[PDB]
């Protein structure tokens, strides 16, 4: 039965001999369930990419990372609770510059999103950065961090976190990889030319999913992750999180 | 135009904020939504599903046989089988369950739990047990004559094959906070000896289950320590 | 099955000459690849594992890098014991496969 | 400290069977995989199969499927390779490797056997 | 939401609907 | 005693009240608003609705379990196995009846669970399983470590999936109905496996003698089949 539930249900008072549980009373429970919703549960701003390129004297100097949630492991076990997911990605780029007193100049950065299926002749100065079809954003170092919303891009109705099958129709696709789902690459470079300064730029990319729709909840993964490409397990030698003992050991059953 | 002044905290990036942002792909039509069975609109529906308690974990328990409680025909009368701590944060039988694994993402938790026991032995196995629930700060009894003074039930294997045990919610605060004592206990003794025929195995098994009632609530999300 | 194409199958070079062997995979195997040194006496010994990292006890003259569609084994300087049969192996997915092999030759008259 | 022992010649007439032996020591044998690789005189290497040391589960190549059988013994800490219906097609040097959780590597190899069958 | 796209709006937390029956009692 | 007859065959079944519809929904034909392909799907009337009985597995005390990926066991069987390679796309549901016949003197418990989108894994290695290791065919497979469900998850939490309990006291048979679970409306028979049927002996077998064999029969009825991309 599908019904609207704003808060947890109340309790009816109880009341010789029968042919249920215990003696209860009348309680009005005002505790809100709103924070347990799938939206509130899965949606949080987390750091999915951390990279600092070495920049001192160049007289490679950028980064592109195909987005997958398996890189941040706290989010991986977070998103492996469900099978199919439907959400809109909200990306925010933060730029911090360290020192290897001069003072900090204000660099201009360009964060360009390249969808899956666009050939990239990857270079810093190559023309694929100036392509008008690719959506780009320009932001300085001192300002509110650049924030864009990525829509839901898929051939199917929702993403596949656990994919049982193989890639393509050549009968060899590296088990556990879904051909239908790849969002694309996120290309970020410094717009300014080469300045012989020893400052290191640290870019942080945050992703908060919204409009989240989940299906088929799955058991959590107790064992550690061996690799990001598949489900293989090993387990710690001693308990906990082992093959023999996942739960901690105690003295005796009567203890 | 419209004169505006900046309030304190303008330009900051907050992680929990909710606002609309500029779309990266204007005039983009997502794939239409299709009906997929088993849509989860709240995490409490996952918690209310029953799950296996592991009562057999002390030592020399590897994998499968930890899910069951061995009972032979040679066990004596009025012997304590097991006691189950109700602590979710610490490691009891309850550490990894459907109610336990979801609750470790939160802090304040309030609700009533449920236990189901099931006897997996043969059809002709006779005998009775007693399941004594211990309120918080109970100071668990030694023998069953002290534990029979509380809330319990005498449960026969032959008549009924299952147990419904509802744990009421008793606390002073509206919620209880996880740690980084003595919330309660559930004990099982031997009412009579285990009677089995000559063609049936001497041993037996019991599988405990736990789920959450409809009043179980959660809040104040945090990070799961289970990572390691 | 994923096939590893090892080329060239043979080459002729002298001492102090940098050579490279490029293997191409049909399906992307990730960062998982191995290089095996086969000595003429019948003993096979590993050299490169997981791209960058190198075996402990093996001299630093051996090196490897990834073009991102391809894998290459770069040797700084050849030695008398550096003439062997090189094999690029993919341990990423079952079944595991071997390269075609490469035999090194010396320029003579 | 760690080595692999696979000596012997084992010449046999066609149509018979052979059970190889790989005895590993110097480490924990039950916790690591076992592998098998053949060295042909025709300058080539083929992958025989892999076996989990724990109980049973194995993986075989399509060409050698049904002609090879792998089994291990955790007591003697040995690895056995069973072959049936030996024809003149099979002549090669059989190797046994280890692997592991990380890298699942080939790092340690055995000496190998010289297997020649003739009618 | 002042933009022209509906997917770029703020997250909607106002849906409280539930159907526990399909899990605890998956019977007809 | 009540017999279930669908198609040109049938099997006698034990009465079990309140069977399991997976996630509380009954499989139905593809609605018009969710359709994609503009062609006309061929609908078998009694053809794909017959019960397909796999090979009965011998269940001993030391048996870890068994798993059958759908429609991998059905890849080649009967007339439905023809339409597997004879059509480019399909969507179908499944009515699974697992019946374990034993006397009143046997003790044990069987957990029959249908795992949607089951991604397996290998123990103590980073190498992804091969093609034959995943897709068994009619034979099926045996769990190496059923306590972790071979995927690294926990068996104690496996009850979140559609399941029924087979206990040798109350009910010796189970009936599970699986609708179409996919992101796409139709899928490819030889590539992706939507469901997985896992029978896990949570409590092992026991008796006085050391050797005891209890057979298990698995029956699968492909209800509500559709097919497109007619070739050959």
Residue numbers in the entry:
A (entry chain A): 1 to 15, 20 to 23, 41 to 80, 88 to 128, 135 to 289
B (entry chain B): 1 to 180, 187 to 234
C (entry chain F): 1 to 109
D (entry chain E): 1 to 119
E (entry chain D): 30 to 57
F (entry chain C): 13 to 244
Paper text:
Specifically, the N-terminus of VP1 is externalized and the first 40 residues are missing in S3, while most of them could be resolved lying underneath the VP3 in S2; the VP1 C-terminal loop (residues K270 to T289) is largely missing in S3, while captured in S2. Noteworthy, VP4 is completely missing in S3, while part of VP4 is present in S2 structure. Collectively, S2 and S3 are indeed in different states in capsid conformation. A better fit in capsid protomer structure was observed between our S2 state and the 18947 E1 particle (RMSD = 1.21 Å) than between S2 and the 18947 native virion (RMSD: 1.99 Å) or between S2 and A-particle (RMSD: 3.52 Å), suggesting that S2 is more close to the E1 conformation instead of resembling the A-particle. The E1 particle is a newly identified expanded state exhibiting a majority of internal regions (VP4 and VP1 N terminus) to be ordered and serves as an intermediate in transition from native mature virion to A-particle.
Enterovirus D68 (EV-D68) is a small non-enveloped virus belonging to the D species of the Enterovirus genus within the Picornaviridae family. The main structural features of EV-D68 capsid include star-shaped mesa at the five-fold axis, narrow depression (the canyon) around each mesa, VP1 hydrophobic pocket directly beneath the canyon floor, and prominent three-bladed propeller at the three-fold axis.
